[PDB]
Each structure stands twice: as C-alpha cells, then as structure tokens.
C-alpha cells in the first residue's frame, strides 16, 4: 500500500525507510507492494494539520505513525494529527506519547499507543503494597485530567480487597503555597504518600514539605515517573521509590515494532470480502470509511508475540499492556535500580533499600497517636455543665462519704441564644459519663480532650 508516517528528523526518516525495506525483504507483497512516505514537524498548529492532511491523504495512505518531538509540550503533534486522521477514521499509531487524555476513546475516535500511559503505572503502586505489609495511604493528587484519572483508577482497583484510601487531598495546578494541605496531612496516622503531579508542582510540594519535618524517619514515600526528572530531582528528599521505563526514548526499536505490527495487520486484512480504497485529496470527499472500524478491530487483536521490545499485546481501549518497569531508588542523589517489574509480580534485587531517614529496616505504615478527642453534650443527669470562675478550676465539692467529685476542663460554646456566635469559653463538665470516661481512660492507658458540640442536637 502507501503507508506514511510523521517523524522528527531526517535520520529517523532514513531509519524508517531502512525498516520498511527490511520488512518488505522479509515478505514481499503480490502486486501492490509497500511504499513509505515521511514528513517533518513544522510547528504552527494549523499549518501542521493542513500539511499532514494534504501530503498524506493526497497519497491514499492506510495508517499513519506519529512520534513525539523532544519539545517539553506533552501535546504537540498528536492533537492536530489525530483529529484530521479521525475524520476519515483511518487508524494512527503513537510512539512516545504517554499522556492519559488520549486513552478516552470518545474524543479521539482512532488512536493506538505503543507505550502504556501514565495512569496505568498506578497499578504498580498496588503491587508495591502487596508484598510489603502496607494498607494505609494518604495519596495526594493534582487537579488536571491525569490526576483525576489516576485517582479514579486506583480507587476502582482498590475495591477488590475491600479496603479504602484515607485522604484524597488535591491542590490547584500552578499554585505557590501548599502548606495547608501538608499541615492537614501531618495530623494523621498513616505514613505512606503516593504524591503524583507535574514537575514544577512536585518541586513546590517538596520544598513546602521539607520545612515541615515530613521527610524524617518512618515516612516512606512513593513517587511516579514524572516527579523525578530534570528539575524535581534537585529538591526531592532522600529515599523516594520512583519508577521508570525500560524502552523509553528509543525510537529505533519502537519504529521496528510498529512497522512489524502494521505489516502483519495489513497482510491479514488484504484477504477479505469487502475492501474499499482510501479517499483521494485533502478536500472533496466527506464520507467516512466503510472499512475503518474493521481495520481497527483487526489491528487491536494482534498477538504479534515476536519482536525486539518483547511481546506486544494490546487491550480493550487501545493501549499497550505487559510492560517492564524498573523500580529505582535514590541514594545520595544517585539513582540506582533496586528491583524489577515483569507483570503482576516484583523481583527484589541484590541491593539493600535505604529508606528516608537512613535506617535500614521496614518502617511501619501506622501510628497509634493515642489522643482520642471526644465529643459530648449536656443532657441533664448524665453530663452536668457549670460555668468556671477566674481561677483555672471549677469548684471543690464533696458527697455523703466526703469523696470529692471528678471534673475536667470542658471546651464548649456559649451561644444558646440564636444569632450570637460561639464564645468557646472553657466551662466545666462532670457527671456519670465523665466518671465512666475517667475509669475507661485509666484502664486502657490513653488520654482525652473532651469538648462539646456546636449545634447541640442529638444527630
């Protein structure tokens, strides 16, 4: 056919031509053969889309390969390319675009990716806490699409064990002060953080939490693949268990795998009952393909389990499954591999993990605190309430046997009348329930911080 592609530089175009020549040498077509046309990245947004549509569907293409230039934009070519290529329902192939928005196959009608998206890495988090005796997380999250998608995926995957996340704190993107959320998360009992945001936000939260003594002993972190790169690897505290990918910025192997898959799919599809040719011209025909959905369906179910990057197996929504992450620790500003992920399993290596702090142990994920703030109300015969005098105490009474009663300092409001705001005067409360609480606290060895309720209703 006339398969085209869009690449970054001329050398990669030469590599693509060599790969297609090798593929044709391995298996030669009957009469139609296989051509190969390529273009370059011209950044103008609109000009890019016009040029690609003209130069590609003017040549009656069958599938387009689009790659990600090294410009830190994270959207670049795929967004203009995919809309035009999906108007006619021709299928496109992604190479190094890991963003999680293209996984929603409702805006982007036709899109296939070779590398797993960011959100899928969240699955590894679960396996991280499978064999480590960890079941309490306070995971943070951003507010863009990727953060919400990752949080939703983790929540829907954590229901198999009938467990539940503790807190789901989120911060607005591109902020400048995140001390409130960190202060709120400090006063808790879980010691596992699954922070996942953008690089600048990661640096901001690292700097904010450094001053809060959050990087001390027994505070195990867990950090995605974006928060250790380029900039955030400067402020991050020691001991973070960041992840990575093996076959990342390696265009040659990905191109070889993609051309192999495309050639196998086209050879499978060429024998069929009804087949139609692609439209000619950027303008003119406005009718969608009658075979496009069939092409996508036959391309997705392609177990091309022979290549150079391992077995290639897609999934229901058009991603790549069964990847191989390389768990990587940060010891004294020198990233070192300390494990391997091979698919639904983890294999520890012959290296001792150094946790934040510098202890060589298995820090516990729970703390008992033992503060036990307690609410109560003034009924009448159970919990008496009497105002206190300006002496730091309430009173000193006795009983028939002369045994003094037991009192505690009571933090309640004084706004019984409507409209007036609460004064929060530290009054005094004592009685049956207070004595029972005293005995219970003495028996179980803990502490109480009794305080009344605001509204005053039984609930």
């Amino acid at each position, epitope marked *: 056919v006339n398969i085209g592609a869009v690449l970054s530089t001329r050398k990669h175009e030469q590599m693509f031509r060599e790969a297609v020549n090798q593929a044709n040498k391995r298996h030669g077509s009957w009469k139609i053969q296989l051509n190969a046309t390529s273009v370059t990245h011209k950044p103008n947004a609109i000009q890019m889309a016009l040029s690609v549509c003209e130069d590609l569907i003017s040549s009656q293409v069958y599938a387009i390969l689009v790659s990600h230039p090294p410009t830190p934009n994270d959207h670049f070519t795929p967004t203009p390319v995919s809309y035009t290529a999906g108007f006619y329902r021709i299928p496109v192939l992604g190479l190094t675009t890991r963003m999680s928005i293209y996984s929603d196959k409702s805006i982007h009608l036709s899109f296939l990716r070779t590398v797993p998206p960011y959100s899928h890495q969240s699955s590894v988090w679960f396996e991280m806490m499978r064999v480590y005796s960890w079941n309490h997380i306070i995971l943070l999250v951003s507010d863009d699409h990727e953060g919400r998608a990752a949080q939703k995926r983790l929540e829907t995957l954590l229901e198999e064990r009938e467990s539940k996340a503790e807190k789901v704190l989120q911060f607005d993107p591109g902020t400048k002060n995140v001390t409130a959320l960190l202060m709120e998360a400090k006063e808790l009992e879980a010691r596992v953080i699954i922070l996942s945001a953008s690089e600048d936000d990661a640096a901001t939260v690292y700097r904010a939490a450094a001053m809060l003594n959050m990087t001390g002993s027994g505070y195990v972190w867990l950090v995605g693949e974006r928060e250790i790169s*380029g*900039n955030a690897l*400067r*402020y991050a505290p020691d001991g973070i268990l960041g992840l990575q990918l093996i076959n990342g910025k390696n265009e040659s192997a990905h191109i070889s795998d993609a051309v192999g898959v495309v050639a196998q799919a086209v050879h499978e599809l060429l024998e069929k009952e009804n087949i139609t040719d692609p439209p000619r011209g950027c303008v003119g025909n406005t009718n969608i393909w009658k075979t496009g959905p069939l092409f996508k369906r036959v391309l997705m179910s392609s177990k091309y389990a022979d290549g150079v990057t391992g077995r290639v197996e897609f999934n229901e929504d058009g991603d790549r499954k069964f990847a191989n992450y390389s768990i990587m620790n940060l010891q*004294n500003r020198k990233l070192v591999q300390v494990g391997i992920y091979n698919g639904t399993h983890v294999i520890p290596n012959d290296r*001792k993990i150094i946790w934040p702090g*510098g202890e*060589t142990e298995k820090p516990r994920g729970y703390q008992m605190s033992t503060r036990l703030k307690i609410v109560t109300i003034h009924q009448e015969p159970f919990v008496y309430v009497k105002p206190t005098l300006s002496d730091g105490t309430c009173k000193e009474e006795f009983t028939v046997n002369g045994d003094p009663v037991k009192k505690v300092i009571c933090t309640g409001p004084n706004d019984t009348s409507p409209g007036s705001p609460r004064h929060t005067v530290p009054q005094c409360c004592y009685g049956f329930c207070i004595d029972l609480l005293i005995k219970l606290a003495r028996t179980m060895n803990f502490t109480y911080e009794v305080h009344l309720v605001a509204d005053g209703k039984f609930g």
Partner: antibody, heavy 117, light 109 residues
Framework: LQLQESGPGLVKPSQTLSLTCTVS?????????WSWVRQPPGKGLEWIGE???????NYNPSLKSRVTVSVDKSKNQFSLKLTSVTAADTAVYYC?????????????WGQGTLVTV | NFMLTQPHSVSESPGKTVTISCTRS????????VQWYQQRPGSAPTTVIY?????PSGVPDRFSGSIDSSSNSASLTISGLKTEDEADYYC?????????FGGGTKLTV
C-alpha cells in the same frame, strides 16, 4: 572527626594496594558516607567511590570493575581492594568525609599519602 | 558526564576585582548547584563556598557566588584582592550519575 590514612608508602607495581583510613572523634554509626577522591599531580580531580556505613557502595562507572571498597565498625575503618594497578595510578590518594543532608558536600578532608608508582 | 572549564589561571594587581567562572558543557546549572573549594599549596583542600548562598562560619564575606542561568556559567566575586588569599580554586558539581571537579585555577597577587 579527624581522618588518617594508614598505608605509608606501599608502591609495589602489578599488585593489589589497599590504603586504610581511620576516624578519630567520630563514630561511623551515623547517616553519612565516605569518599576517596583521588588527586593526580599537576591536573584536576577524579572521584572514585563511596560506601555507606552499613551495606552498599557507589563507584564511578568508568573504573567500575576494578575497585572494591569495604568498611568495618569493629576496628572502625574502611579500605579499598584496588586491583590491576597500572602506570597511570601515580596519584596521591585522599580520604574525605561528606555530609548526606540534601547536598553532596565533602567535610574536612584527610592528610593524604604519597603512594606513587 | 560533562566537564567544567577554568582555563588555566588568573592574575591581577592588589585591590582589583576579578574572578574565574565555571562553565558547564552539557545540560544547565539550575538543578544541581555547584560548590567552590579552596586548596592552599602543600595542604589538603578546604571548602570556601557551597550553594553560592551559604557561607562557612569564620570565612570573610569577600567571596560571594552567583548563578547566571543564561549560558551555564556560575560566577564568583572575590573583590578586595590582597596577598594572603593566594591559593588554588576548584569548582565541583554532580548529576544523576557521578560527581565531577573542575580543571584548576591559581590567582596571583
């Protein structure tokens, strides 16, 4: 917290040379590291490797297959096991401590030796 | 891996203002800040400045570091030249793989 290097002048060629270093006034049971910056004469510097107080090392990737560094708390000292010394090893070897913190910054250095072959 | 350039030396009359600069070949000096080391002749090197913003206790405030963040060239100020500061000055940095040092520089007064 003063460091002193043991091997006075062992300069035997085509052998294994093992300088040893000890620390006075400080205990290795801490959250620090120890490095062996090598100083060629008349040129710049070249970092060699570091060893944590308990279990793991970090060498330079260039000469990553010829240097093994070990520590022992009982005698409170660390030393290397450099093998296959060549004519390019005529450099004075140092013994310097760093501070983990959040920076790679070396503490007060050692006296240094005169091991040149 | 990269390399930091201090070509060979510097020299000026007493009371002048001149200092060498550290140039980084690959990447940019924005993440891994550099440090300046002082090496008196016939003695082990000793630190003179770190992070270009914090100073060791007791060292005179004559030295002051800065980061250009424009052409990957960290700069130093040793204004107030005089005799006793005759020594060698070194520039050291690190990255995700190793830690590297500069070439070398001696000042003449």
């Amino acid at each position: 917290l003063q460091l002193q290097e043991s091997g006075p002048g062992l300069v035997k060629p085509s052998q294994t040379l093992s300088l040893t270093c000890t620390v006075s006034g400080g205990s290795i049971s801490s959250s620090n590291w120890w490095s062996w910056v090598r100083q060629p004469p008349g040129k710049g510097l070249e970092w060699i490797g570091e060893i944590y107080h308990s279990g793991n090392t970090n060498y330079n990737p260039s000469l990553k297959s010829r240097v093994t560094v070990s520590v022992d708390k009982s005698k409170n000292q660390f030393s290397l096991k450099l093998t296959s010394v060549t004519a390019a090893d005529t450099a004075v070897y140092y013994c310097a401590r760093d501070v983990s913190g959040g920076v790679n910054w070396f503490d007060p250095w050692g006296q240094g030796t005169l091991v040149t072959v | 891996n990269f390399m930091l350039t201090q070509p060979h030396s510097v020299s000026e009359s007493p009371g002048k203002t001149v200092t060498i600069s550290c140039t980084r070949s690959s990447g940019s000096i924005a993440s891994n800040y550099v440090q300046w080391y002082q090496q008196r002749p016939g003695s082990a090197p000793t630190t003179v400045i770190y992070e270009d913003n914090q100073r060791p206790s007791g060292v005179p405030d004559r030295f002051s570091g800065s980061i250009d963040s424009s052409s990957n060239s960290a700069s130093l100020t040793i204004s107030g030249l005089k005799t006793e500061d005759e020594a060698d000055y070194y520039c050291q940095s690190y990255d995700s793989s190793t830690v590297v040092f500069g070439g070398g520089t001696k000042l003449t007064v």
